[PDB]
Amino acid sequence: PYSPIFGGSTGGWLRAAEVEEKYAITWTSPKEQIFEMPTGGAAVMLIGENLLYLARKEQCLALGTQLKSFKISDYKIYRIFPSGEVQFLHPKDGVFPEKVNPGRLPVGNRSFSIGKNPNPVSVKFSGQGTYE
Amino acid sequence: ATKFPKFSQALAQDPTTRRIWFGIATAHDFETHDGMTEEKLYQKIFASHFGHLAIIFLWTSGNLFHVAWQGNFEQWVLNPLKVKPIAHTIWDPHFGEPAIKAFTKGGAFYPVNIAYSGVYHWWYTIGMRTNNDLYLGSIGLIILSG
Amino acid sequence: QAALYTHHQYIAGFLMVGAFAHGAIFFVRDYDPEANKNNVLARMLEHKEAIISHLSWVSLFLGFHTLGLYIHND
Amino acid sequence: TKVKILVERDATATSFEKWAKPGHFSRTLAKGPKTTTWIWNLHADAHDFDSQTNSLEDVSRKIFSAHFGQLAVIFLWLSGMHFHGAYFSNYLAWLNNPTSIKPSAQVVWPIVGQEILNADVGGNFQGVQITSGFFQLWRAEGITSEIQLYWTAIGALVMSGLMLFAGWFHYHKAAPKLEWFQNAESMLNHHLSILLGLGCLSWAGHQIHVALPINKLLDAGVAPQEIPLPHEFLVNRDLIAQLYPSFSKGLVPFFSGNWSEYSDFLTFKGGVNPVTGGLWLTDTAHHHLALAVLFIFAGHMYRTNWGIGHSMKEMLEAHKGPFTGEGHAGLYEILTTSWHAQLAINLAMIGSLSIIVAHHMYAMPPYPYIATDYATQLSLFTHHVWIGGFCIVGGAAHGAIFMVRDYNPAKNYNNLLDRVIRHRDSIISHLNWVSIFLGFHSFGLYIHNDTMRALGRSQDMFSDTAIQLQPIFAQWIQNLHLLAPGNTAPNALTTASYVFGGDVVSVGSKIAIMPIKLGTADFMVHHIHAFTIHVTALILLKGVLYARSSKLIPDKANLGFRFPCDGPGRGGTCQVSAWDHVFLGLFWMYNSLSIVLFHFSWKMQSDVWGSVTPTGAVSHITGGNFAQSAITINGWLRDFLWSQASQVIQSYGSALSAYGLIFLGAHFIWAFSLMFLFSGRGYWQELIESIVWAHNKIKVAPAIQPRALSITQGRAVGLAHYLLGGIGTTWAFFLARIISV
Amino acid sequence: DVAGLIPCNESPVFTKRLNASVVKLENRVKKYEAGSPPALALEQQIERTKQRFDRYSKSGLLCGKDGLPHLITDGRWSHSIEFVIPGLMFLYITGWIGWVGRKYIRTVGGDTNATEKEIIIDVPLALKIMSTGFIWPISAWQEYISGTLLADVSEITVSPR
Amino acid sequence: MDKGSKVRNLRKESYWFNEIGTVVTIDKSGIKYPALVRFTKVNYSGTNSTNFSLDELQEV
Amino acid sequence: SHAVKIYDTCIGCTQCVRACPTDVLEMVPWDGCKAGQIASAPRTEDCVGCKRCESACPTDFLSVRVYLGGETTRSMGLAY
Ligand code: CLA
């Protein structure tokens, strides 16, 4: 239906996509043009909405980078589970991670230089490394 | 728990064959085992050392038993310069007849390996003379390992 | 005799490599720089560059010249 | 007139200003050295023109003039060879008595006692015995004097100067425009009709007028002094009519169509000349004449300026079937817009052609007295085999480079390249299966034979006196080639080569060439060859196909052609680039060619090369121990390496001592390579940090900070030293084993 | 004397080696006409071999049971000629080299293009420095006692020092 | 301390530890590492400058 | 999953976020830097451990650091 015109390749997803998380990428193409598949050789993107399926988030983000840096197209990425659940992944709040977005909260932030971590001997026999 | 390596939850959750490989290579690193304390570490090391001593003594008892049961120790102590000490017999169904004839040496009457460990000279020096002495030593070592 | 000598020399090499490996492990996960302040062991790390550089010089000297003499004879 | 000459006058100014600014070509290196890595980069990107300019015209002008420079270097090398033959060689003495005199054209100054390397080759001469077969080549040309060699060297020097001047002129004075380069039809017409067509025609003329009569007189026993000069064979026709009484008729038969009258010196007898042990010169003359005709004909196939001809673009677009979508649509643009694609094809073809040359030259010795020169035959075979392997792997590497850089999916929609990339997984999986099958079966035959021989169960091995694996197909082909003369090649008097079957051609009591029988050992070794070739193809094809992307790295193309890794993520991502695939393929190519050379050497020493008695009895070098000893790994270790390595190890104190020294040096370099191959960059960087502290403590500190070799450079150095050590070891081994004779 | 070594002057094995070398060279030259360039080269080789063996006999080297000269390197002055004298020369030459190099490093180092002056040597300055190395020991000692030879502890290091 | 003043580095993890670098800019607008310093030698990454806090610099 | 940590030495240039292939990193408002932004690793379950973020870091020592740990299907770079 909305999938880009592709002749098929042996590099698509495999059984884990059916049994584990699969990924989908949607975008809008102003015109019809040829882009390189992360798996196969080449595919034609439809005018308007294009929906594509992949087995790894890295493939989706590589294709998104290709679109952004070559055809200046905005894109969205979702994760589909076998149970039917769908989760929105790449634009987490409608703005790319490079751009600052008020409301985000820091995660994994340490308030001291990297060289002030505790020694391994200090954290020993506890299920933790120096960074944690 | 939940998979092969209990001592590593991270490896237990690993879905690849890596879980197996590292499960072998992290076994004896008691420090890194989940929920490990100093006291349990020391006690496990102590028990492991007991096991290793048992292994060593069983290895020695095996050497003694094989020399006593299949060796030519008595013939060797009679004439220790010309005969070659025997290690153990060779029961290999893959051998061909010429191989069986070729590996028959020393005392003969069976295929045999010529011991290069020097255990014959050592046992002769320390005073052993008969296969009975070797057998008694091996039985004592088996009991010690138990 | 040959078997015994080779056997024990190889085991000695293995044991020495293991000793140094476990010393590296000790430094990684057992050393406490606060408890060894100005200690002999801490001073070992204090001038590690000198130790490593002079060891490298000795190794290069021996290798260069021994190999040179062997090739000269050849 | 679509095909036309276009040039730019004074394209580049000639000055030394750039010569004092190393790294000027690349934008990154032009800023000067901050660390020592810069230095290495300057020698690594020197000839990477595509990465220096974004314009194809500039890259094309650089390639053209670099090719001119290479031609100048080759001509200088030829000049040196010919000059050392004329002034420092015993060519005349060898001419007089080729069998006994050992060729030699190199002399060593006595400075440290190295004059021992001046062997007692013969002819009142002392020098290093050469194995380049130059003496046989010169004799085939009817040189017969050192003045001719001297003038050949002078001409080569002048040609080298002309090539240098042409390179300079075609870069800095008259640089052809890009449209000039993109003429595949015209270029092919000119390279086929003239370079290869008229080249063959001119060489055939030389042979008919110079080489043929001179070599015929030499075979008759005429001393070189009494042989008239070659120009004397061009002025008085009768002087040639005595040798070939068909010139008397002249050129009138040629134009009248009665070519049969030339059968005197244009023959099809084949086989080998019994006297010199080489191919008949008349056969080679007819061969080159026919090739000249064919090349001239084939050079008119492509359309250049007059309507008639073939347009390769239409030709490719026309070939498309149901299984391949768009067929060969877009390949012409690929091969006329990217030098890497063309270089890949050309290198693959040159390498395969070099290997074919190596195979054909030993089977049918083309030059006089080259067959019995066992040292020359072996050296030429191994040299050209190595060159062929290197060229094949280079073709693979440049195909990968094209895929990474010059591949454009927009212009390659659903064509052959697209479809190959789209079933690359199936291709690689099946190649992997066939490689494993070949390896298992072929090498397990050897392991099984070794195990059975060790267990005393000789009746259970894969040997002639045991379970037999006869190469029935090869034997059938040999029989057909044997029966060809008179039935399928009625006008050919003798078989193409005596390898297939026939008499034993021996010259001067030495077996020049004899039939080669194929047994179970030949079967096993041939399947070993196939296994190694399939594995090398696996590695290189996998590097080419997965050069742009993979299930690990969907965006590998952005990382470039050669990069160390993509980090320790996803498990580990070491050696994931196509350059690393070439790095491994070089090892596997070296292994396969080592096996090929060992097979050739042992088979020829044990089954072909040897001596004959007046009765006709044959005595080979190793007594035919190949059949019953080439079927186990221990047999190769003992009867080939250990047994034939006696010459090298015992060469000290003789003229071959240099070969023993090089044997040891090659072993040393091979072992040295393992230091780079096994170790990683971090250790060396930290060691260099300590050494830099030591230097700094004495206020010695280079402004160019030292750096450990990059990961890619570490691998490249390790591979280069590994190959040098292996090649040198086998070089010394073969040359000392085949010069003690 | 030293370790049961008999001087090569009275070593029968040494003379046997000399005779073997000469006789093998003579056997090699017997297959060339007198006066032929190969014959002259082989005769010159024979003469050079004889001179080498005579020089070794006259030098005072110590032979072994194998007849080859052996070197004594325990500091014995009577055998300094073997190792001590050449060693000094080496330590001089290399010393010179090293010193000169260091000076160049510390001369072009005080420039903005210090790196650019290492790939491209300032040949005039380079030769100026190179001509000064014959007094490298004195200059080195003067710098050592003047504190200009070694850098202070205030220099680059690593996290654990 | 001031623009263009030489400062000895004191950051233990820094590639230019115990080395002299020239101050390029100082941020008076708060910030934890406001003092930008530039060194002659390039680190392994090719950069030759870093931000330090005034506590991690010895003045001269 | 791997552990990604950002230290306060960060100068908020965004290069680490751009280099990330799995969209693990992002920019969040901050006040300890001139740019007013700092890197964060809210979703490290998608981190593969390629350490591209560390390679693309101007700060003397890697204000962004990656420590490899337990391996899952996502972090192991497996399409299967
Ligand atoms: C009694 C002495 C002793 C003791 C108690 C230990 C104990 C330990 N060592 Mg140390 N070590 C020793 C000797 C010792 N080692 C020696 C002699 C060496 C030098 C080789 C080392 C080198 C060493 C290193 C380099 C490391 C350790 C580590 C460790 C820890 C983990 C070991 C582990 O997981 O095993 C896993 C066990 C295996 C993977 C089994 C491998 C067995 C060998 C390699 C294969 C043999 C194949 C067989 C011979 C083939 C048959 C031949 C046939 C086909 C013909 C553990 C605390 C590791 C650590 O991190 O500790 C904190 C670590 O990194 N050790």
Ligand code: CLA
């Ligand atoms: C035969 C193999 C070989 C050789 C010669 C070396 C040589 C060396 N190794 Mg390596 N190494 C090897 C194998 C080898 N390694 C392997 C297989 C491993 C396991 C991965 C290692 C692992 C290793 C480590 C981890 C370390 C070494 C170190 C050393 C040095 C030891 C000190 C020494 O001998 O200085 C003398 C140097 C030599 C003998 C090298 C040859 C020098 C030649 C004779 C000079 C030739 C110059 C000539 C003009 C070249 C012209 C080239 C031109 C024609 C193109 C030296 C550079 C140590 C080191 O760096 O010490 C400072 C060190 O830390 N090596």
Ligand code: CLA
């Ligand atoms: C191209 C292939 C080739 C090769 C491999 C050789 C090799 C050899 N030749 Mg042959 N030769 C060649 C071509 C070749 N030559 C040609 C074309 C001619 C015709 C002119 C000759 C004429 C010739 C004669 C007449 C003789 C040789 C001799 C020799 C031997 C000693 C050469 C030597 O070291 O002398 C010493 C050479 C040097 C010390 C080289 C000079 C060093 C320069 C100055 C270094 C400059 C490098 C520079 C800094 C680089 C930057 C560029 C700069 C200019 C800007 C050697 C086996 C001699 C021989 O065999 O004696 C028995 C001998 O007598 N050759």
Ligand code: CLA
């Ligand atoms: C017809 C004349 C002729 C003659 C007398 C020779 C003679 C020779 N050739 Mg040559 N050769 C010829 C034509 C000829 N060749 C042509 C036309 C080709 C192109 C395929 C070749 C390709 C060739 C190769 C690749 C090699 C030789 C070799 C040899 C030598 C091997 C010994 C022998 O008995 O050769 C007998 C020769 C043959 C049995 C080959 C006959 C080939 C036939 C004529 C092919 C005809 C193709 C046909 C015209 C296609 C037309 C298509 C077109 C209309 C579209 C010998 C000197 C070998 C050599 O010198 O190695 C040292 C070698 O390796 N030949």
Ligand code: CLA
């Ligand atoms: C027609 C032949 C041909 C041509 C024109 C090129 C041209 C090129 N190649 Mg290709 N290549 C070829 C053959 C060729 N190659 C072959 C046969 C192989 C197989 C090994 C390769 C493998 C290859 C790889 C893997 C790569 C290239 C690359 C390149 C580019 C850069 C080359 C460069 O900077 O040189 C620099 C030259 C040197 C640094 C000289 C080193 C030469 C070797 C290592 C030493 C030689 C030793 C000597 C023979 C014997 C020493 C004796 C000892 C005792 C001293 C350039 C486009 C590189 C690239 O990125 O291109 C895009 C690249 O990554 N090529």
Ligand code: CLA
């Ligand atoms: C002599 C050492 C050696 C051996 C045996 C192998 C073996 C192999 N290599 Mg490796 N390789 C080696 C050295 C070696 N390599 C080195 C030094 C390099 C560095 C350049 C490489 C680099 C390399 C690459 C880059 C590639 C290979 C590939 C291969 C495979 C080729 C397919 C094959 O033959 O499968 C059959 C296996 C064998 C012939 C091994 C011997 C097995 C015998 C016959 C039977 C063993 C007994 C039996 C199992 C009994 C079972 C019971 C027992 C367990 C008790 C195979 C696994 C290729 C591959 O994997 O793809 C196909 C590949 O791509 N190798």
Ligand code: CLA
């Ligand atoms: C003039 C320059 C210079 C000076 C003064 C020194 C001085 C020293 N080096 Mg360093 N070194 C140098 C260049 C220099 N090196 C270069 C170019 C290399 C790279 C090959 C090294 C690699 C090196 C290592 C790996 C080690 C040393 C070590 C040492 C120390 C002991 C001596 C030694 O082992 O030499 C060894 C020298 C070499 C291995 C190569 C020297 C090559 C040439 C001869 C030197 C450069 C001369 C150059 C042309 C100067 C021209 C001046 C002109 C322009 C005016 C000593 C502090 C050792 C140490 O730390 O001891 C504590 C040590 O382990 N050096």
Ligand SMILES: CC1=C(/C=C/C(C)=C/C=C/C(C)=C/C=C/C=C(C)/C=C/C=C(C)/C=C/C2=C(C)CCCC2(C)C)C(C)(C)CCC1
């Ligand atoms: C009586 C006498 C003698 C003797 C003397 C002597 C004095 C000897 C000595 C000897 C010795 C004296 C030896 C020693 C050796 C040493 C060693 C072998 C060491 C080692 C070390 C190590 C191994 C380390 C380790 C570690 C690490 C790594 C880190 C930290 C931790 C640790 C510590 C663990 C004689 C007869 C001769 C002479 C006369 C007199």
Ligand SMILES: CC1=C(/C=C/C(C)=C/C=C/C(C)=C/C=C/C=C(C)/C=C/C=C(C)/C=C/C2=C(C)CCCC2(C)C)C(C)(C)CCC1
């Ligand atoms: C080795 C060499 C050399 C030399 C060489 C030479 C010397 C060569 C020559 C060559 C030659 C000398 C060639 C010639 C050629 C010729 C030709 C190729 C011809 C052709 C002709 C034709 C083709 C014709 C045609 C016709 C006629 C017959 C007339 C009528 C019509 C027509 C037109 C059809 C040198 C020393 C420098 C150096 C190194 C390299």
Ligand SMILES: CC1=C(C/C=C(\C)CCC[C@H](C)CCC[C@H](C)CCCC(C)C)C(=O)c2ccccc2C1=O
């Ligand atoms: C030894 C070694 C080094 C250190 C080696 C270095 C720095 C090379 C030193 C080269 C010297 C300084 C040049 C002189 C060498 C010879 C005397 C002759 C020149 C040889 C060619 C350069 C022409 C690495 O950096 C490395 C990096 C990655 C994997 C493996 C390794 C590795 O094995």
Ligand code: SF4
């Ligand atoms: S070991 Fe080296 S090549 Fe492998 S991932 Fe790490 S840095 Fe890259």
Ligand code: SF4
């Ligand atoms: S690359 Fe480094 S400095 Fe730049 S935003 Fe990321 S963590 Fe901060």
